[PDB]
Design a protein around this ligand. Sequence first.
Ligand code: N9I
Ligand code: N9I
Lengths: 304, 304
Amino acid sequence: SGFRKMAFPSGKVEGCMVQVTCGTTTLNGLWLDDVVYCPRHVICTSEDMLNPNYEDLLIRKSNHNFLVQAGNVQLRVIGHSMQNCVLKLKVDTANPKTPKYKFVRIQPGQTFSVLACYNGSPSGVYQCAMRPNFTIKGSFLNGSCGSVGFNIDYDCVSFCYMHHMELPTGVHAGTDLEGNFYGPFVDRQTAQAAGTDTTITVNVLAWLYAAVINGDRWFLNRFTTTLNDFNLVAMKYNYEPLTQDHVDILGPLSAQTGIAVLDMCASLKELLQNGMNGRTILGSALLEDEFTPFDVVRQCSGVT
Amino acid sequence: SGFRKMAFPSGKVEGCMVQVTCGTTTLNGLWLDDVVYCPRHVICTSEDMLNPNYEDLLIRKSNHNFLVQAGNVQLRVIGHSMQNCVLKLKVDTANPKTPKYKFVRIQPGQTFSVLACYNGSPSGVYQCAMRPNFTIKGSFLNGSCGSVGFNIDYDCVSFCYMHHMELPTGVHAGTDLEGNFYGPFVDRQTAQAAGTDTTITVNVLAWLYAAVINGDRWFLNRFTTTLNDFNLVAMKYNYEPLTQDHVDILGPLSAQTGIAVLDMCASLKELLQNGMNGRTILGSALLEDEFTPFDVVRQCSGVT
Ligand SMILES: Cc1ccncc1CC(=O)Nc1cccc2c1CNCC2
Ligand SMILES: Cc1ccncc1CC(=O)Nc1cccc2c1CNCC2
């Protein structure tokens, strides 16, 4: 029992972190096989930041300008290419610690672990969700760029995020491992609107099921609702509309607890309309949306 | 910017996890050098649980009865001994992945990361605090016993906790790595009173400083207080009394922000007396006490 905001064990990812320096800029790279992936803004100086012409800046660089260091050893760079907002530095040595891996583009509302790094060294690990507006609320300081987000399925690490930028609002933006930004963001030092965010309804319901499984049941009520009625409430409270696909994904948790999804929706409806009245659920005084239904089942079943 | 409940990178600890089986019981062990540490209750059956005579149960066991498996390879057990509530299984092979390590007994109110494991395999990592009453609010299922808590200082892992038990209340109890329980707990299947818990005042103030550093400042007020006046409020709200040692530990955060510790105490006093009024601080609707002043500085400075 107990329910925590659990991250994946970061070991397989720690073995891939390297430091990449170009000119006077240092950030993190991800070394998989004989390629090191890092944000392309490593080639920028301070004057470039506002409106960089990455193609021109990269043309002034040669393989020997990209200093890649894996802990204490130096990697020899034999190729460089830009793919969207990432640089791919071909090195002459395959990473001996390369785990089984995939590059994936996650959907908004999905969760992943971040291994925050500075100078190629891991500092900490935390779990977060990709917001519906494609930002993440991380913990990143200057030098953390190139830190990655990932999920693990037994022995396979699916890398889904590489950190690039902190928006003026203090929220974070980045790319998939092919260098495509999540959201409308560009790698420029400029104010950039992040869309209106919403609460991930299916995740809140998953977390309410986790609460019931772990003994927090005070919020269960005598009511039910419909998808239409619940969605009128979700609209008013800036929650994502619930669909039958979301109900279907909540099926295993509904079966385990015996609480029909629409009955849990009626509990969530009452919590939205009345608040918590100074009470808590799983140690939180707000409705938590950073656990997917898959996360709840995994944590509640002890998947390793 | 941003502030997260960050765990240490778990890689150095993942390399030490093994599975220990004795009879029909399987749990986790920690393999450091040529010794495997695990909870002594691995030698119990279901009838033993209520009042085990561990000395007698251990006498019926021989080295070959303790099956230790590190991933896919079997370790040869050449010695066994019980030290308090832990068993130490001497093996013929030193763990090649043994990091630099220490065994430490942490103080209540201090924080650490837990690498939850099942069958010797890591499932997830999370950060928590040792409560003032010596329990931890973890996320542990049957089979997680032997999972450990730790802190990391550059390359040295200080192991501070080994998981043993879930109390009937759903909170967790365990030992230091010498097998001494934190708190009054015994490794028996019985109802055991956990003392009255309190909120870790110095940690809440550290987290309020983290909030100010990261932009959440609405709670700052025009007031100040004294240690005596603040402690009358801490008493009423079940908070640990603040001492000059706690004020001194908050010195670096007070210096960085320019907010005197007693002025932050007056902000905390107003939050205790009036609540949050439906507002949030660092994404929380309650006063968070699982970050020490050291954690706040480490996260805010990017220590790797
Ligand atoms: C300060 C910080 C904190 C947390 N996470 C990231 C950062 C740095 C950042 O946003 N860098 C950046 C992002 C887009 C483009 C460029 C840069 C840097 N100059 C080159 C052009
Ligand atoms: C079920 C669970 C969930 C989370 N964490 C731990 C557990 C198991 C547990 O409390 N075991 C235990 C703790 C003290 C003593 C003994 C045992 C087992 N039998 C032997 C004597």
